[PDB]
Design a protein around this ligand. Structure first.
Ligand SMILES: Nc1nc2c(ncn2[C@@H]2O[C@H](COP(=O)(O)OP(=O)(O)O)[C@@H](O)[C@H]2O)c(=O)[nH]1
Ligand SMILES: [Mg+2]
Lengths: 166, 320
């Protein structure tokens, strides 16, 4: 039983905490609770191999961008989250991808692009163009709702694979 | 290089239009010019003593657009950026008065506040850690609440504008009067300033590992109190701070309502105006397509394009 050090990154309000809490606690709650820096641990079996998840849920407000260099150097996998109803959240993915690729100094770096809030009717972001960004990063793209439990085990569990098969 | 200040008069006049039609549009196109733009607008607006107009209105339109309320100002916008810049420019002394004492304390401490059973060392006594944390906090929060009146009038008026905006929008929702303020003064000011003291130049030393971690625990505590959230249903291991949260909620509410209650509003600019024009020229094409849409801005955005073209012409004639 090894343990993977996953880091959930992206713009404020995209649902990084909701994803972690859907995973970790298996329920949802709409609320106002912006994150500074939360950490969670959860032991789980993926593929039949029992492992332990070490999940850092981050603050994506600009004035916390000094924090990242740290969380990036120590992190093994990066879950890059945007909101399928927010195109700004989507363009902010570029900041992250490009710092991750300096601090680690690799174009290969375990990572999964996440299109959260997919339960909502107001898509401003089409799978197609997310599909493509991901394909151009050479990484998997997974749509999710933390609201519905949809794509969530998938999204964390894929990023684990990304690290193992890395 | 740039033209005399007189050359931009018609331009300036349009920018300063109350409806802020130009600024709204620019908020759409800037993209990666976002800081630079913010920087220029503020200098211009401050020069006109119209910052309030800029920030109240631009914050107001962002509240208008929101629809969903637990996402408000949670992302990056031009509005968020303006606020960040305006707050650095005018609220540093406030941050020093309220925070410096306790930040210095935390740096030069050497006892751990670690609560998470997983991070605890051999022999490390979580009972003491919690006591150290709760004390640091107790002091800090005292100093914060007692700087309620050191915050400059104009910023407070802007916070006032925020309260009135979410009023109109969500009259029946009785949480947003304080949350909207919490998001700027804690999430986007104080909590960062604790996390990264260099922010407002409180101290320029990298924290010890423990100080580093203390500032984080602290800011987590303060952001939870700021939000009015008791620990337990999220991270498990922070239960021991809820008494601090429970005994300070009413003071946090007072502090957040009071802070906005001010309803009385309390050199050459060709460099700045030139540079703003440069940005308009640059996003010339994206600006056309916004003036292809109807509504009451269209009028103004077309006058814009005129002047943008016209000014670029005048600058060519200046060119050698
Ligand atoms: N509809 C919907 N709302 C979500 C979803 N995930 C998060 N949210 C909401 O979006 C807001 C932001 O959630 P949060 O985890 O705090 O955002 P963060 O800053 O990325 O952590 C809250 O109102 C959440 O309930 C989702 O999958 N669907
Ligand atoms: Mg969060």
């Amino acid at each position: 039983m090894t343990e993977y050090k996953l880091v959930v990154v992206g713009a404020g309000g995209v649902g990084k905490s909701a994803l972690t809490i859907q995973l970790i606690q298996n329920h949802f709650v709409d609320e106002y609770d912006p994150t500074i820096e939360d950490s969670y641990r959860k032991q789980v079996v993926i593929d039949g191999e029992t492992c332990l998840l070490d999940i850092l849920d981050t603050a994506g407000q600009e004035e916390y961008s000094a924090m990242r260099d740290q969380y990036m150097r120590t992190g093994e996998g990066f879950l890059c989250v945007f909101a399928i109803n927010n195109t700004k959240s989507f363009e902010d993915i570029h900041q992250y991808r490009e710092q991750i690729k300096r601090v680690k100094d690799s174009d290969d770096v375990p990572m999964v692009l996440v299109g959260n809030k997919c339960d909502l009717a107001a898509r401003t972001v089409e799978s197609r163009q997310a599909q493509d960004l991901a394909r151009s990063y050479g990484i998997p793209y997974i749509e999710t709702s933390a609201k519905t439990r949809q794509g969530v085990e998938d999204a964390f569990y894929t990023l684990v694979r990304e690290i193992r098969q890395h | 290089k740039i033209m005399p200040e007189e050359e931009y008069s018609e331009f300036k006049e349009l920018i300063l239009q109350k409806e802020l039609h130009v600024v709204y549009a620019l908020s759409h196109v800037c993209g990666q010019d976002r800081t630079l733009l913010a920087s220029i607008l503020l200098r211009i607006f401050l020069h006109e003593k119209l910052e309030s107009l800029l920030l109240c209105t631009l914050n107001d339109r962002e509240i208008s657009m929101e629809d969903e309320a637990t996402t408000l100002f949670r992302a990056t916008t031009l509005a968020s950026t303006l606020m960040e810049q305006y707050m650095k420019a005018t609220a540093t002394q406030f941050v020093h008065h309220a925070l410096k004492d306790s930040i210095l304390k935390i740096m030069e401490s050497k006892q751990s506040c670690e609560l998470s059973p997983s991070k605890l060392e051999k022999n490390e006594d979580v009972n003491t850690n919690l006591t150290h944390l709760l004390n640091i906090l107790s002091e800090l929060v005292e100093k914060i609440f007692m700087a309620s009146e050191i915050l400059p009038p104009t910023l407070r008026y802007i916070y006032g504008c925020l309260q009135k905006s979410v009023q109109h929008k969500w009259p029946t929702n009785t949480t947003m009067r304080t949350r909207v303020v919490s998001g700027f003064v804690f999430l986007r000011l104080i909590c960062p300033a604790i996390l990264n003291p260099r922010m407002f130049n409180i101290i320029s030393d990298s924290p010890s590992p423990i100080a580093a971690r203390t500032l984080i625990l602290v800011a987590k505590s303060v952001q939870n109190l700021a939000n009015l959230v008791e620990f337990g249903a999220k991270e498990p291991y922070m239960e021991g701070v809820n008494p601090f949260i429970k005994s300070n909620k009413h003071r946090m509410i007072m502090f957040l309502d009071e802070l906005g209650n001010v309803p009385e509003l309390p050199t050459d600019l060709s460099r700045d105006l030139a540079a703003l024009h440069e940005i308009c020229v640059a996003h010339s094409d994206e600006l056309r397509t916004l003036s292809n849409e109807r509504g009451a801005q269209q009028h103004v955005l077309k006058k814009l394009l005129a002047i943008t073209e016209l000014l670029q012409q005048k600058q060519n004639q200046y060119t050698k």
